[PDB]
Scaffold this active site. Structure first.
Site, short mmCIF file in Angstrom:
data_model
loop_
_atom_site.label_atom_id
_atom_site.label_comp_id
_atom_site.label_asym_id
_atom_site.label_seq_id
_atom_site.Cartn_x
_atom_site.Cartn_y
_atom_site.Cartn_z
N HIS A 48 0.80 -1.23 0.00
CA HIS A 48 0.00 0.00 0.00
C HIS A 48 0.84 1.29 0.00
O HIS A 48 0.37 2.32 -0.48
CB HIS A 48 -1.04 0.01 1.12
CG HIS A 48 -0.50 0.29 2.49
ND1 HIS A 48 -0.29 -0.73 3.41
CD2 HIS A 48 -0.18 1.47 3.07
CE1 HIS A 48 0.16 -0.14 4.50
NE2 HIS A 48 0.26 1.18 4.34
N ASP A 97 -1.07 -7.46 1.18
CA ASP A 97 -0.35 -6.20 1.38
C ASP A 97 1.11 -6.41 1.71
O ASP A 97 1.51 -6.32 2.87
CB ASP A 97 -1.03 -5.36 2.45
CG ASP A 97 -0.54 -3.92 2.52
OD1 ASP A 97 0.21 -3.50 1.62
OD2 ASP A 97 -0.92 -3.21 3.47
N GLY A 188 1.57 6.10 9.76
CA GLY A 188 3.01 6.32 9.66
C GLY A 188 3.84 5.10 9.98
O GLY A 188 5.04 5.09 9.69
N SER A 190 3.10 2.13 8.66
CA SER A 190 2.95 1.35 7.43
C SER A 190 4.23 0.68 6.99
O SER A 190 5.26 1.34 6.91
CB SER A 190 2.49 2.26 6.29
OG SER A 190 1.17 2.72 6.51
C1 UJ7 Z 1 0.14 8.26 4.44
C2 UJ7 Z 1 0.04 6.97 5.22
N1 UJ7 Z 1 -1.34 6.56 5.31
C3 UJ7 Z 1 -1.48 5.29 4.99
N2 UJ7 Z 1 -2.60 4.57 4.98
C4 UJ7 Z 1 -3.91 5.22 5.14
C5 UJ7 Z 1 -5.00 4.18 5.40
N3 UJ7 Z 1 -4.58 3.07 6.28
C6 UJ7 Z 1 -5.40 2.50 7.24
O1 UJ7 Z 1 -5.02 1.67 8.06
C7 UJ7 Z 1 -6.83 2.98 7.27
C8 UJ7 Z 1 -7.76 1.81 6.95
C9 UJ7 Z 1 -7.57 1.27 5.54
C10 UJ7 Z 1 -8.23 -0.10 5.41
C11 UJ7 Z 1 -8.23 -0.66 4.00
C12 UJ7 Z 1 -8.60 0.32 2.90
C13 UJ7 Z 1 -7.93 1.67 3.08
C14 UJ7 Z 1 -8.16 2.21 4.49
N4 UJ7 Z 1 -7.15 3.50 8.64
C15 UJ7 Z 1 -6.11 4.40 9.25
C16 UJ7 Z 1 -6.40 4.64 10.72
C17 UJ7 Z 1 -5.31 5.51 11.32
C18 UJ7 Z 1 -5.23 6.87 10.64
C19 UJ7 Z 1 -5.02 6.66 9.15
C20 UJ7 Z 1 -6.07 5.74 8.54
C21 UJ7 Z 1 -3.24 2.49 6.12
C22 UJ7 Z 1 -2.49 2.78 7.40
O2 UJ7 Z 1 -2.55 3.85 7.98
N5 UJ7 Z 1 -1.77 1.69 7.86
C23 UJ7 Z 1 -1.02 1.80 9.09
C24 UJ7 Z 1 -1.86 1.48 10.26
C25 UJ7 Z 1 -1.88 0.31 10.99
C26 UJ7 Z 1 -2.81 0.33 12.06
C27 UJ7 Z 1 -3.47 1.53 12.15
S1 UJ7 Z 1 -2.99 2.61 10.91
C28 UJ7 Z 1 -2.49 3.10 4.96
O3 UJ7 Z 1 -0.33 4.71 4.59
C29 UJ7 Z 1 0.68 5.74 4.62
C30 UJ7 Z 1 1.25 5.89 3.25
C31 UJ7 Z 1 0.42 5.80 2.15
C32 UJ7 Z 1 0.94 5.94 0.89
C33 UJ7 Z 1 2.29 6.15 0.73
C34 UJ7 Z 1 3.13 6.21 1.82
C35 UJ7 Z 1 2.61 6.09 3.08
#
Ligand code: UJ7
Length: 241
Positions: A48, A97, A188, A190
């Protein structure tokens, strides 16, 4: 140890240099993701993170970091030669993922130089989540120092309950954390690790999950969802030749 050696996120504590020698920081533009060094030229991260398909030449991997923002003489900065997302990754469900980054080797065929502070993590064959993400949902800034928190596995039966994540938990995913909340991965984190000490193998750090997604951070009945690394062992071995 050949792998998993160790020198010394909401509800976590600081993880100083050498506590997670395998952890990798991936930077490009204004974006960031974490990863795990699984071999001298290979880093396992979340798919992702790389959905928008940045060019490999725009990526930088940093090994040996404690604070993300500091320049650090012993830290190793490496270019990325290429990357491979899991071909089945779904941006809708987040199933499959996982992604591999092939680090750029030097003129001598070397990528990461191993040291007490930089060591690969074992693949599967007690548990902690680590990262520089938000210390609470809605935090204005990423953590300055690497954070670590102890989180236990949650069975598929308990995580797939309707008050937890229900039908959202698909094959290839696992949950870790607490139904009480308070301790978990956050935005963050991720791509970062969920590592366990393998008691059967001299407590060597073993990568059990990749930080994938969550409904909030540390909320009651909403533990973090990770990519189950053991589920993809053959894929990882097949694509790291
Ligand atoms: C910029 C960064 N934001 C993300 N994301 C935004 C969504 N997300 C979530 O979990 C979504 C749900 C998902 C479910 C499936 C469908 C899509 C929504 N909910 C979260 C809740 C907390 C606040 C943010 C949203 C991912 C995440 O944060 N993963 C880390 C986490 C693990 C546990 C808790 S948060 C990816 O990844 C990073 C990134 C992206 C792109 C390039 C570089 C970095």
């Amino acid at each position: 140890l050949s792998c998993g050696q160790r020198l010394r996120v909401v509800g976590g504590l600081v993880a100083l240099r050498g506590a997670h020698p395998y952890i990798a920081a991936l930077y490009w533009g204004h974006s960031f993701c974490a990863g795990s060094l699984i071999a001298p030229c290979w880093v396992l991260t979340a798919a992702h993170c790389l959905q928008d398909r940045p060019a490999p030449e725009d990526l930088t991997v940093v090994l040996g970091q404690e604070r993300r923002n500091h320049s650090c003489e012993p830290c190793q900065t490496l270019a990325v030669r290429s990357y491979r997302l899991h071909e089945a990754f779904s941006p809708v469900s987040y199933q499959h993922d996982l992604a591999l980054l092939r680090l750029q080797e030097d003129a001598d065929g070397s990528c990461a130089l191993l040291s007490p502070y930089v060591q690969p993590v074992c693949l599967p064959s007690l548990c902690q989540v680590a990262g520089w993400g938000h210390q609470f949902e809605g935090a204005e800034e990423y953590a300055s120092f690497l954070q670590e928190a102890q989180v236990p596995f949650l069975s598929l039966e308990r995580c797939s309950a309707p008050d937890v994540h229900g039908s959202s938990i698909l094959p290839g995913m696992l949950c870790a954390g607490f139904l009480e909340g308070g301790t978990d991965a956050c935005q963050g984190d991720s791509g970062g690790p969920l590592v366990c000490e393998d008691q059967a193998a001299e407590r060597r750090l073993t990568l059990q999950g990749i930080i994938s997604w969550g409904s909030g951070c540390g909320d009651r009945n909403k533990p973090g969802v990770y990519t189950d690394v053991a589920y993809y062992l053959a894929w990882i071995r097949e694509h790291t030749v």
